[PDB]
């Protein structure tokens, strides 16, 4: 693909005293000569990695992969989502969105042109 493995694995919070917010465990790993050296781990929120997720759609309407999900349809992605926004069911649910999380991430960091957007290309490491 591209030497690149991460893995998102449940969701932490990080906030704590009113509003606590949850990061998002990304440990992206390429020994190849672009970049992060020795592999690691980055924390961040959704409301940022959402911006890929979100954007990825932008690209078009129709033609252009029309799914922010993984690669394909991977029943995660489209199926029967029905609502829009975020809603969460479950405590776990959370963790459910985090794992379809690396499947889209790893098309954009598999392909250098898939991901298209400058921050896109940076944000699989993107820390805060």
Known sequence: QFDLTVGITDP???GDGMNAY???KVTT?????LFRSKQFA???RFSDFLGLYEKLSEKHSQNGFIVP???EKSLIGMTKVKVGKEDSSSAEFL???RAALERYLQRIVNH???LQDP???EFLEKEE
Not at 29 to 33: D, E, F, I, N, R
Request: glycine share 0%.
């Open 112 to 114: 250098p042109t898939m």
């Open 95 to 97: 963790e459910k969105r």
């Open 119 to 121: 921050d896109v290309r």
């Open 29 to 33: 790993q390429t020994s190849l000569p």
């Open 22 to 24: 949850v990061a998002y």
């Open 12 to 14: 932490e919070k990080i």
């Open 42 to 44: 980055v924390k961040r």
């Open 69 to 71: 999900p993984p690669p």
